[PDB]
């Protein structure tokens, strides 16, 4: 299971920071992939980064919005938004990807719960 | 060409010349 | 309060020397009869500075002693402190710390150089703040402004405030061709507003002062564009997309179909919207320009794999499956669409009518548990392949307006104009409409097939019609060509609409031709 | 007769003769 | 177009031409080149 | 992870405006969802992205509410809207 936050209990106006947390595996040696999804319809992808070599494919789509951060110090992923908007109404996948030893890519587990609010 | 295996048919060629159309208020060609 | 600044504003545009010449400079100005805002100091709020203010005031004591230009005035934005004690006029343009109101009663730059009017118009261009006065003890008269002094500050400035420790004005400068008149000395003794009146467009044209009884053609007519005719044909012909991705049974996984789509309009848009499909990735092609654009030679390779080969089927992969399976060039253009299908093509018992090559020479059953992974489970994969004609997406489709000026767009030509019911009838393969000068002069829209014209926009000449200025001083506007209804009493006419005079049942030996038979007088 | 026997706006204007034909 | 004589220059046949008639009644494989278009 | 809507219950008229809440827990983003589900059926899901706008959707629906509440603002009930709105939890 992947560990992240639950639902909401604040005002409006505050500023807040996410986490994505696996267990039983090292964080930074497996690919982590972002994708994005919100009511109405299917999934949006833009894109993973690799903080090994710092390989990152955008998707032609992301206009620069979200920019795409990384804290080698505490070695965790977290992602933070340069300006927010009334209407950046999003919710973002975190998943384990491929192994190091594997060259072939796969999507075999998928987040276990972020409900999501602001 | 090729026929129905089991007629007075012309074959022309063609070759850039200058060309004067003449069409009626329709827009077809009658000269 | 508001009031009539009636010819005030008149400053000299250079310091060029010029004799008895009507000289006409394109300098901006206030403009003649304007509206000039007077204000009372009994408070001081912050007030315009397009390009330049028409300042004036009627003191007898000296009250105002204070100029605050900028726009934070908090030691960031360039602020003045322009003052004047009676004794000079001493020009401070360094930066001092205001508070909530600056104190009556670091620094860049400082510099020192009731029966009275006291104008003192500004101006900045070319980083040239000059500022004009002229002290002549609003009345209908007019006196130029000698260029008092001339600061090379370079900075850009758009507000101002004047302060003192009770009748301050301000005035909007614009862009306004403008006529002088100078005297022998060198000195301006009379001038011309130019967009005034049309008898004021007839002094810049004839660049004088004494307009003689004529019709002066000042300017042409014109009408401009509304808005914007973009028409493509029905999307009625849309590609039978509905049963591909619904069939009953698909191919197998060696036995891949390729198909060619053309000769059909397909909406991408909603497919790259809406992700029921699992997978979306696009090479060598912008979805911004999608919509935009279009492509040719389209084809579309489905097939139905596992889940976890979707990634090995893409440019620098190397393994067994890929290598032995289907090769992706290192050009590719197009996009990868897969997704699940697992709640439709798949069973309990398994199906063995799936079968896969164990050996090959050279390059060019499953077990179903709930417990399986995402890989394991059946993906239905389509591929786009796009090289960069008769397929295009629907891109733009507005409605048709006519009997109004716009911007028409017909398949992909451009032309402004207005369009006119037609009766004439063409040929079925026939579209555009020309007359002798090769011009189009007809067209059909290409979602129905009704005949419309094209006609050019209601366009011609403006000429003024005036007696002497000496005589009169309200005018006729002639228009040319365009009938009266686009543009006082109107008047209709062959020549066109005449604003301005009036219509006589008489007739007298006419003096100043109109055209088209009618004649104007006095 | 001589008005039978005797036989577009793009920037050019042919602007009519105040003396009309009639 | 509407009642102009408007002049183009493209690929036609010429008039009076000397057509080369064929029969439909060497019939094998009646070939012959395809150089500008034929009418 | 546990789910309240309000209020329970109402009462009013035909055409009356009908507002509803769904509530929350702890710290995150910004994301969340409405549903028309029936009363064993599946859920439906008009529009989308929150901050896109899907065409053909009708401009009557609309969503709001920032901080911990998300008001549902119904203007007026229509014979094909009579369902109950799920805010629903997944991952
Ligand atoms: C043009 O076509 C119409 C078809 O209705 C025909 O009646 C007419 O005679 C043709 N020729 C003209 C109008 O000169
Ligand atoms: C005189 O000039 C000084 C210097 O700018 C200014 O501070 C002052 O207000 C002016 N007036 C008087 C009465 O001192
Ligand atoms: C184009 O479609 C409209 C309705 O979508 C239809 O009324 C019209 O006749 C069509 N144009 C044709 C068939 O030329
Ligand atoms: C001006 O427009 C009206 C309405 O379109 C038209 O009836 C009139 O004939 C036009 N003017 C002239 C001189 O034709
Ligand atoms: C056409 O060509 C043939 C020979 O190829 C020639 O005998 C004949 O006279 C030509 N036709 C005319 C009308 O001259």
């Avoid at chain 2, 070759?15 to 009626?24: I, M, S, W």
């Avoid at chain 3, 008769?390 to 489709?397: A, F, I, L």
């Avoid at chain 3, 060509?481 to 008047?491: A, K, L, P, W, Y």
Wanted: glycine share 6%; proline share 5%; charged share 15%.
């Amino acid at each position: 299971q992947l560990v992240q936050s639950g639902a909401e209990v604040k005002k409006p106006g505050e500023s807040l920071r996410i986490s994505c947390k696996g267990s039983g595996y090292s964080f930074t040696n497996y690919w982590i992939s972002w994708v994005r999804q919100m009511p109405g319809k299917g999934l949006e992808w833009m894109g993973r980064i690799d903080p090994s070599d710092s390989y990152i494919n955008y998707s032609p789509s992301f206009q620069g919005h979200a920019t795409i951060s990384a804290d080698k110090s505490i070695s965790t992923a977290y992602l933070q938004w340069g300006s927010l908007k009334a209407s950046d109404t999003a919710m973002y996948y975190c998943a384990r990807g491929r192994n190091y030893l594997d060259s072939r890519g796969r999507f075999d587990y998928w987040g276990q719960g972020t409900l999501v609010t602001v | 060409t090729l026929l129905a295996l089991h007629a007075a048919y012309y074959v022309g060629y063609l070759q850039p010349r200058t060309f004067l159309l003449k069409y009626n208020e329709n827009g077809t060609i009658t000269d | 309060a508001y009031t009539n600044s009636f010819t005030r504003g008149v400053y000299y545009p250079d310091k060029v020397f010029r004799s008895s010449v009507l000289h006409s400079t394109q300098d901006l100005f206030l403009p003649f009869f304007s509206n000039v805002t007077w204000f009372h100091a009994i408070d001081n709020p912050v007030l315009p500075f397009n390009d330049g203010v028409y300042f004036a005031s009627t003191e007898k004591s000296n009250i105002i002693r204070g100029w605050i230009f900028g726009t934070t005035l908090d030691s960031k934005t360039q602020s003045l402190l322009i003052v004047n004690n009676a004794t000079n006029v001493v020009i401070k343009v360094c930066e001092f710390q205001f508070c909530n109101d600056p104190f009556l009663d670091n620094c860049t730059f400082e510099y020192v150089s009731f029966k009275n009017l006291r104008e003192f118009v500004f101006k900045n261009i070319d980083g040239y703040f000059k500022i004009y006065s002229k002290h002549t003890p609003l009345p209908q008269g007019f006196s130029a402004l000698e260029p008092l002094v001339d600061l090379p500050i370079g900075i850009n400035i758009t507000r101002f405030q004047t302060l003192l420790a009770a009748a301050y004005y301000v005035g909007y400068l614009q862009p306004r061709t403008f006529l002088l008149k100078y005297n022998e000395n060198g000195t301006i003794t009379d001038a011309v507003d130019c967009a005034l009146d049309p008898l004021s467009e007839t002094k810049c044209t004839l660049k004088s002062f004494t307009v003689e009884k004529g019709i002066y053609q000042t300017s042409n007519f014109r009408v401009q564009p509304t808005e914007s005719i973009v028409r493509f044909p029905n999307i009625t012909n849309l590609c039978p997309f509905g049963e591909v991705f619904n069939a009953t049974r698909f191919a197998s996984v060696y036995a891949w179909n390729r198909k060619r789509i053309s000769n059909c309009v397909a909406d991408y848009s909603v497919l790259y919207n809406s992700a029921s499909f699992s997978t979306f990735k696009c090479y060598g092609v912008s979805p911004t320009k999608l919509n935009d654009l279009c492509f040719t030679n389209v084809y579309a390779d489905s097939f139905v794999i596992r889940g976890d080969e979707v990634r090995q089927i893409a440019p620098g992969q190397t393994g067994k499956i890929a290598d032995y399976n289907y090769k992706l060039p290192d050009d590719f253009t197009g996009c990868v669409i897969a997704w699940n299908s697992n709640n439709l093509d798949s069973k309990v018992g398994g199906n063995y009518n799936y079968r896969y090559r164990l050996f090959r020479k050279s390059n060019l059953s499953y077990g179903f548990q709930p417990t399986n992974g995402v890989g394991y489970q059946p993906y239905r994969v389509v591929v786009l392949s796009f090289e960069l004609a008769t397929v295009c997406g629907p891109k733009k489709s507005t409605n048709l307006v006519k009997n109004k000026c716009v911007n028409f767009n017909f398949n992909g030509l451009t032309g402004t104009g207005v369009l006119t019911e037609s009766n004439k009838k063409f040929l079925p393969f026939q579209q555009f409409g020309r007359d002798i000068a090769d011009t189009t002069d007809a067209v059909r829209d290409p979602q129905t097939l009704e005949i419309l014209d094209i006609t050019p926009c209601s366009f011609g000449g403006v000429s003024v019609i005036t007696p002497g200025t000496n005589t009169s001083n309200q005018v006729a506007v002639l228009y040319q060509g365009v009938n009266c209804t686009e543009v006082s009493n109107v008047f209709q006419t062959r020549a066109g609409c005449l604003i301005g005079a009036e219509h006589v049942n008489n007739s007298y030996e006419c003096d100043i031709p109109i055209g088209a038979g009618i004649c104007a007088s006095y | 007769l001589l008005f039978n026997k005797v036989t577009k706006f793009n920037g050019l204007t042919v602007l009519p003769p105040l003396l009309t034909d009639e | 177009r509407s009642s102009v004589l408007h002049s183009t220059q493209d690929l036609f046949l010429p008039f009076f031409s000397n057509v080369t008639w064929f029969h439909a009644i060497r019939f094998d494989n009646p070939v012959l080149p395809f150089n500008d278009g034929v009418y | 992870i546990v789910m309240t809507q309000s209020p329970s219950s109402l009462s009013a008229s035909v055409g009356d405006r009908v507002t509803i809440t769904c509530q929350a827990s702890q710290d995150i983003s910004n994301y969340l969802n409405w549903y028309q589900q029936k009363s064993g059926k599946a859920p439906k899901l008009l529009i989308y992205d929150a901050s896109n706008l899907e065409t053909g959707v009708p401009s009557r629906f609309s969503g709001s509410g920032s901080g911990t509440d998300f008001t549902f603002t119904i203007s007026s009930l229509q014979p094909e809207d009579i369902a109950t709105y799920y805010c629903q939890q997944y991952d």
